[PDB]
Design an enzyme around this catalytic site. Structure first.
Site, PDB file in Angstrom:
ATOM      1  N   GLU A 288       0.827  -1.454   0.360  1.00  0.00           N
ATOM      2  CA  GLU A 288       0.024  -0.170  -0.212  1.00  0.00           C
ATOM      3  C   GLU A 288       0.717   1.184  -0.261  1.00  0.00           C
ATOM      4  O   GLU A 288       0.484   1.961  -0.706  1.00  0.00           O
ATOM      5  CB  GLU A 288      -0.957   0.370   0.829  1.00  0.00           C
ATOM      6  CG  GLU A 288      -2.005  -0.953   0.899  1.00  0.00           C
ATOM      7  CD  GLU A 288      -3.028  -0.836   0.090  1.00  0.00           C
ATOM      8  OE1 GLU A 288      -3.131   0.337  -0.235  1.00  0.00           O
ATOM      9  OE2 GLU A 288      -2.617  -2.072  -0.698  1.00  0.00           O
TER      10      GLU A 288
ATOM     11  N   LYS B 223     -11.717 -25.396 -19.660  1.00  0.00           N
ATOM     12  CA  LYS B 223     -10.871 -25.789 -18.270  1.00  0.00           C
ATOM     13  C   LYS B 223     -10.422 -27.268 -18.163  1.00  0.00           C
ATOM     14  O   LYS B 223      -9.262 -27.359 -17.426  1.00  0.00           O
ATOM     15  CB  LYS B 223     -12.122 -26.004 -16.532  1.00  0.00           C
ATOM     16  CG  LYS B 223     -13.053 -24.505 -17.118  1.00  0.00           C
ATOM     17  CD  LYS B 223     -14.373 -24.810 -16.370  1.00  0.00           C
ATOM     18  CE  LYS B 223     -13.929 -24.047 -14.908  1.00  0.00           C
ATOM     19  NZ  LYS B 223     -15.477 -23.577 -13.697  1.00  0.00           N
TER      20      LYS B 223
ATOM     21  N   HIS C  50     -15.251 -10.271 -10.272  1.00  0.00           N
ATOM     22  CA  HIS C  50     -15.148  -9.458 -11.213  1.00  0.00           C
ATOM     23  C   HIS C  50     -16.091  -9.825 -12.862  1.00  0.00           C
ATOM     24  O   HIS C  50     -16.550  -8.765 -13.566  1.00  0.00           O
ATOM     25  CB  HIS C  50     -13.845  -9.507 -11.388  1.00  0.00           C
ATOM     26  CG  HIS C  50     -12.788  -8.716 -10.343  1.00  0.00           C
ATOM     27  ND1 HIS C  50     -12.970  -7.531  -9.895  1.00  0.00           N
ATOM     28  CD2 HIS C  50     -12.072  -9.058  -9.830  1.00  0.00           C
ATOM     29  CE1 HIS C  50     -12.322  -7.247  -9.170  1.00  0.00           C
ATOM     30  NE2 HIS C  50     -11.441  -8.390  -8.384  1.00  0.00           N
TER      31      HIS C  50
END
Ligand SMILES: *[C@@H]1O[C@H](CO)[C@@H](O[C@@H]2O[C@H](CO)[C@@H](O)[C@H](O)[C@H]2NC(C)=O)[C@H](O)[C@H]1NC(C)=O
Ligand SMILES: *[C@@H]1O[C@H](CO)[C@@H](O[C@@H]2O[C@H](CO)[C@@H](O)[C@H](O)[C@H]2NC(C)=O)[C@H](O)[C@H]1NC(C)=O
Ligand SMILES: *[C@@H]1O[C@H](CO)[C@@H](O[C@@H]2O[C@H](CO)[C@@H](O)[C@H](O)[C@H]2NC(C)=O)[C@H](O)[C@H]1NC(C)=O
Ligand SMILES: *[C@@H]1O[C@H](CO)[C@@H](O[C@@H]2O[C@H](CO)[C@@H](O)[C@H](O)[C@H]2NC(C)=O)[C@H](O)[C@H]1NC(C)=O
Ligand SMILES: *[C@@H]1O[C@H](CO)[C@@H](O[C@@H]2O[C@H](CO)[C@@H](O)[C@H](O)[C@H]2NC(C)=O)[C@H](O)[C@H]1NC(C)=O
Ligand SMILES: *[C@@H]1O[C@H](CO)[C@@H](O)[C@H](O)[C@H]1NC(C)=O
Lengths: 98, 595
Positions: free
Chosen positions: B355, B461, B485
């Site tokens: 951060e 997959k 998302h």
């Protein structure tokens, strides 16, 4: 809440002379089309305002700026800095300036 | 004309800033002190920003775009001229917003209650998250896997299907072919004589790179398949693929959950300097003091001294309703803020840098114009931060700060451990990130008809990722739709490339910092020249196309995976001893139900 009582001019046709001052508020036109005295496209009021909040980083906080400039035009006796004066002595051969 | 636009942006880049400054301020004060009136106080202030943006968005269609010569002011207008929406019918405009939050809430209201007890009904984050995280039961985790997407993604399938339809007609009205063409638009750079970049070429770049690491991903998949017969006997064939419900989480994006059962040396104590901090009374100020002390040692400036008081480092002592998530706020005007809840571990010591790196990245391009104050692309913002957390994972860094005993001897038994913790994070996501975004675009460009959208999803997959389903799925589950998302309309290619950009920054600095050992032992600290080359890239932001920006540190014009495979070579030396008897490869015909 924003101290918006400090403004600055961002628009002019020509750059100033040295020491020039322009307190006029004439509505700027950037484009070819005239505006009949109102604002519009390419046609802007040439004053904007400083947004100031106290939680802003340095470089965005207002500074109180004092600009000097000396002049020597033709005047006889004017002002100047302060001239100190040492303690006077007596009864001794001394080198003095009065 | 050109000279009418270059004055218009001097109007826009002053009246937008002080309206941006308050709209991020209300989202700051609400997020540190949650009330009801501050929900309202940020709604109108955020509505002052949206109405002002759609006010001047239509003004850039007065100017024709291709009569401009300066590329700098050409870049500002082409972002601003972007309509996005507003080009369609308005009953159709609200029709997508009728779809959109309804697509948003169904993901957030997904409740699951047992057939034996339909009264205890769990949400996703409470309980259901902990079932796939630590509970080791086979018959449990198949029930949690199936009943999530059959009860959430079954319902968004008549929501998403019509939502693909009206997304593309807006997109083609901006002269594209699909919505897949729109997302490539952040990477597109045209006409600068040698740094040019077209939209279709990234498909070629991802198809070339991903095939090169496919030895390694086949080798982690071989090694873990040699390990899962112990924790799960009589359930997985050693030749075939893995069932989709034991993968660490609900979809198995991260494999960090599988370090414990798959540790190299369980008797070897991994470094977790947590007890060392508490025996020296390490408060919240002591953590961010070293994190700043590391960044002055590399050749980057201090904190702005309005960072300290204006940020919230811990949770408050009062019972204070506030969202707790480590974010970096970049409100503007030289005000940059952090917000998290520190608990003094080595884990929160690691995210104390990731951060802070976002701050120094946003401390970098503060001299840019307003429409260019991001990373050079969307993958660069999380890429610059995470390489600063990699430098703290080196044990030479910790003993140099006075936290490890000086007689700590870096045996190679913990190096096989420590690189295997990274390998279940770094390499564990990249066959996941590519296999989804490959699927989403053929749906976007319409290469698959809607009766085959699930039919061609569960094929790819198996072959690429080596995962087999627990349950045969007909066309009525929208198994892709269940992800965050995915259900929240977010561009998913920004997570693949962000990994590749990291190590290209990493080893090029460790070449500059004169390291001689392996890649996981280089240290950027105490150097200046590793700071100077990096600072050359950070001051750009978006003023330069990123293809010039990437060669400013490394020297190439596209993503290069050869730094990435430089990392795992002490590991991959060790790993090839572990596939002398196992079968590196999967057969995509075997299923756990077809027996
Ligand atoms: C959270 O914010 C609200 C409003 O933003 C605070 O409520 C009042 O805020 C004003 C600020 O102008 C104070 O003068 C009042 O005294 C506050 N009300 C009370 C009852 O104290 C609220 O105080 C904030 N939360 C906390 C814990 O301070
Ligand atoms: C057009 O591009 C030129 C450079 O290609 C920019 O010129 C710079 O302008 C700034 C201030 O405007 C000067 O401090 C620099 O010295 C100039 N650089 C060069 C190389 O001349 C110019 O600013 C651009 N136009 C606009 C409107 O931004
Ligand atoms: C934004 O949307 C408009 C559609 O409303 C696009 O087209 C413009 O349409 C109006 C009338 O509908 C014309 O007067 C303009 O001349 C059109 N624009 C141009 C450039 O010819 C507009 O192109 C869209 N802008 C973008 C960047 O996609
Ligand atoms: C750590 O380094 C030591 C020293 O090289 C390795 O020990 C040797 O390993 C080889 C490989 O089987 C043996 O043939 C030697 O007899 C070992 N020597 C000693 C003194 O033990 C060790 O294998 C390395 N460990 C790892 C995990 O790579
Ligand atoms: C890397 O930076 C650290 C931090 O200054 C240096 O650590 C010093 O180490 C010496 C000997 O161990 C101590 O006497 C000093 O007190 C340390 N410095 C501080 C500020 O405590 C270290 O020397 C640097 N590396 C190199 C190669 O110079
Ligand atoms: C950062 O702050 C420290 C305070 O101890 C100061 O000594 C140092 O000079 C500052 N850094 C720079 C680059 O000036």
């Amino acid at each position: 809440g924003g101290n918006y009582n400090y403004l600055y001019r961002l628009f002019r046709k020509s750059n100033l002379k040295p020491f020039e001052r322009d307190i006029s508020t004439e509505i700027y036109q950037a484009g070819s089309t005239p505006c009949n005295g109102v604002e519009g496209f390419n046609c802007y009021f040439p004053l904007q305002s400083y947004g100031f909040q106290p939680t802003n980083g340095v470089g965005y906080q207002p500074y109180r700026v004092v600009v000097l400039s000396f002049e020597l035009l033709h005047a006889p006796a004017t002002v100047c800095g302060p001239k100190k004066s040492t303690n006077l002595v007596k009864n001794k051969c001394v080198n003095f300036n009065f | 004309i050109e000279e009418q636009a270059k004055t218009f942006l001097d109007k826009f880049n002053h009246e937008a800033e002080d309206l941006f400054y308050q709209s991020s301020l209300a989202s700051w004060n609400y997020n540190t002190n949650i009330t009801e009136e501050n929900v309202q106080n940020m709604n109108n202030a955020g509505d002052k920003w949206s109405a002002f943006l759609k006010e001047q968005s239509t003004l850039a269609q007065m100017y024709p775009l291709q009569e401009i010569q300066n590329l700098t002011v050409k870049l500002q207008l082409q972002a601003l001229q972007q309509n996005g929406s507003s080009v369609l019918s308005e009953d159709k405009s609200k029709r997508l917003n009728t779809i959109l939050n309804t697509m948003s809430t169904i993901y957030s209201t997904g409740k699951v209650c047992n057939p034996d007890n339909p009264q205890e009904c769990l949400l996703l984050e409470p309980g259901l998250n902990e079932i796939m995280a630590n509970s080791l039961d086979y018959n449990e985790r198949l029930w949690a896997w199936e009943s999530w997407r059959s009860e959430v993604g079954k319902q968004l399938r008549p929501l998403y299907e019509e939502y693909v339809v009206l997304k593309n007609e807006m997109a083609r009205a901006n002269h594209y072919e699909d919505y897949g063409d729109y997302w490539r638009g952040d990477y597109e750079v045209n006409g600068v004589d040698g740094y040019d970049y077209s939209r279709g070429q990234l498909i070629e770049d991802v198809e070339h790179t991903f095939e090169e690491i496919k030895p390694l991903y086949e080798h982690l998949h071989a090694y873990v398949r040699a390990k899962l017969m112990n924790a799960y006997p009589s359930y997985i064939s050693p030749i075939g693929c893995l069932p989709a419900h034991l993968l660490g989480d609900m979809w198995g994006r991260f494999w960090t959950n599988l370090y414990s059962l798959t540790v190299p040396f369980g008797q070897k104590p991994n470094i977790d300097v947590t007890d060392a901090m508490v025996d020296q009374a390490w408060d919240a100020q002591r953590i961010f003091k070293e994190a700043e002390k590391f960044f002055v040692s590399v050749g980057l400036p201090n904190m702005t001294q309005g960072f300290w008081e204006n940020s919230m480092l811990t949770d408050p002592g009062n019972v204070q309703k506030a969202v707790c998530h480590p974010t970096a706020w970049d409100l503007g005007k030289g005000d940059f803020r952090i917000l998290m809840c520190t608990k003094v571990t080595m884990d929160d010591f690691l995210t104390a840098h990731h951060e802070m790196g976002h701050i120094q990245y946003d401390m970098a391009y503060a001299a840019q114009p307003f429409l260019l104050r991001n990373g050079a692309n969307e993958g660069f913002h999380e890429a610059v931060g995470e390489i600063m957390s990699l430098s703290a994972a080196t044990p030479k860094h910790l003993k140099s700060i006075g936290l490890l005993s000086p007689d700590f001897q870096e045996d190679n038994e913990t190096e096989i451990n420590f690189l295997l913790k990274q390998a279940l994070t770094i390499v564990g996501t990249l066959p996941f990130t590519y296999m989804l975004e490959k699927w989403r675009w053929m749906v976007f460009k319409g290469e698959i008809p809607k009766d085959q959208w699930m039919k061609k999803w569960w094929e790819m997959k198996r072959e690429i990722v080596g995962v087999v389903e627990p349950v045969p799925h007909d066309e009525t589950y929208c198994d892709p739709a269940s992800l965050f998302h995915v259900s929240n309309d977010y561009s998913f290619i920004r997570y693949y490339t962000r990994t590749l950009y990291q190590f290209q920054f990493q080893e090029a600095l460790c070449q500059a910092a004169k390291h001689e050992g392996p890649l996981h032992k280089c240290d950027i600290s105490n150097s200046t020249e590793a700071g100077q080359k990096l600072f050359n890239m950070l001051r750009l932001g978006k003023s330069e196309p990123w293809t010039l920006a990437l060669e400013n540190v490394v020297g190439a014009k596209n993503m290069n995976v050869r730094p990435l495979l430089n990392y795992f070579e002490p590991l991959f030396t060790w790993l090839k001893d572990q596939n002398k008897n196992s079968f590196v490869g999967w057969s995509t015909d075997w299923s756990p139900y077809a027996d």
